[PDB]
Design a protein around this nucleic acid. Structure first.
Ligand SMILES: Nc1ncnc2c1ncn2[C@H]1C[C@H](O)[C@@H](COP(=O)(O)CP(=O)(O)OP(=O)(O)O)O1
Ligand SMILES: [Mg+2]
Ligand code: NA
Ligand code: NA
Length: 326
DNA sequence: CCGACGGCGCATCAGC
DNA sequence: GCTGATGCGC
DNA sequence: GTCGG
């Protein structure tokens, strides 16, 4: 539904979420406010009262009261107060830097470091990840048009196959679901030589992507997970492309399609679909699907060579990534 | 009333 | 030096 | 903050 509908309420609730996460360090309250914001965002009527909102799952007594105040006055006193608080507003702002969480943000502000400018002046106090987040502060907040995501996929699949034609690589996330923009790029990688039974398999791929100057920085890298930065090549005379976030995950072959399913999402759909599998005698996670015995004891992971196999264990019919919004 | 609300890879800290 | 905890992001 | 055992 249109934002004008309840956008004021949803904006209020998201701002509250952010203060709970970044300032109060209350992650579960952050998620409570986000859940309330989502269900309200999907509500196809302009909310007239807190009572009306309370009928939705995730909206309770306190949010109902906040909605009543917002509706009667057009603001929320406590949010107005938080906004003008130099300490709170600065802490909340610094967490937009990738690598600066609530703990780091609090410490910086405690010592007089409140702005990106102060961060620039204080490089020695920033760890590697934080320096990268600062460097690309603006770029990391931009979204990625699907047309660029396709150019990016083109490079990733080409270079992976060039390293070893037996690798399998799948760009997952919202992109695989057919979205017209993405926040970042998620790549799942596997290889026949890597099973749960059985490295350098990930390194070889990261190395090649750096060699062709697609990967530009590294946030973290181990034997199964890479998190870093990449950029599309620019044409002479054209404005250069923003730097983008990319993650690459190496997963065992025998867990690969459970991973593709899971990392394609949405979370709504995942959380959603864990359900059916249960009621049908199955426990599912990002790695495996296992049968639940008559007392609830999990059996060995079931064999899986496709996304559809998973649906076929729970007697469902394949639903394309296109239709997995929920 | 009162505990769950996701869990885990990687980087870095804290303590030994 | 090593092992476990914490912070962070997802 | 909300839900639910
Ligand atoms: N809070 C959560 N709980 C459970 N699962 C979650 C999750 N957040 C993300 N996931 C899962 C599903 C995503 O497809 C996948 C990657 O999460 P992602 O952060 O890359 C979001 P996509 O779903 O990629 O949107 P976007 O990138 O275009 O903005 O991991
Ligand atoms: Mg993504
Ligand atoms: Na951050
Ligand atoms: Na952030």
């Amino acid at each position: 539904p249109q934002e004008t509908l309840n956008g004021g309420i949803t904006d209020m609730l998201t701002e509250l979420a952010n203060f709970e996460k970044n300032v109060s360090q209350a992650i579960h309250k952050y998620n409570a406010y986000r859940k309330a914001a989502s269900v309200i965002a999907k509500y196809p009527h302009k909310i007239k009262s807190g009572a009306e909102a309370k009928k939705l799952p995730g909206v309770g007594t306190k949010i109902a009261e906040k909605i009543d105040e917002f509706l009667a006055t057009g603001k929320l006193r406590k949010l107005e107060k938080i906004r003008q608080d130099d300490t709170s507003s600065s802490i909340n702002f610094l967490t937009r830097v990738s690598g600066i969480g609530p703990s780091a943000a609090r410490k910086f502000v405690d010592e007089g470091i409140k702005t990106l400018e102060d961060l620039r002046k204080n490089e020695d106090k920033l760890n590697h990840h934080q320096r990268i987040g600062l460097k690309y502060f603006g770029d990391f907040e931009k979204r990625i048009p699907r047309e660029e995501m396709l150019q990016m996929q083109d490079i990733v699949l080409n270079e992976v196959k060039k390293v070893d034609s037996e690798y399998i690589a799948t760009v997952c996330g919202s992109f695989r679901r057919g979205a017209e923009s993405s926040g970042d790029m998620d790549v799942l990688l596997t290889h026949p030589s890597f099973t749960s039974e059985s490295p350098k398999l990930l390194h070889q791929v990261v190395e090649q992507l750096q060699k062709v100057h697609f990967i530009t920085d590294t946030l973290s890298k181990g034997e199964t997970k890479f998190m870093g930065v990449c950029q599309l090549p620019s044409k002479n005379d054209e404005k250069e492309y923003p730097h983008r976030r990319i993650d690459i995950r190496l997963i065992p072959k025998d867990q690969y399609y459970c991973g593709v399913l899971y990392f394609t999402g949405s979370d709504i759909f995942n959380k959603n679909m864990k359900a059916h599998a249960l009621e049908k005698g199955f426990t599912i996670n990002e790695y495996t699907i296992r049968p639940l015995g008559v007392t609830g004891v999990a059996g060995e992971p079931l064999p899986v060579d496709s996304e559809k196999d998973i649906f076929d264990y729970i007697q469902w019919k394949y639903r394309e990534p296109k239709d997995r919004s929920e």
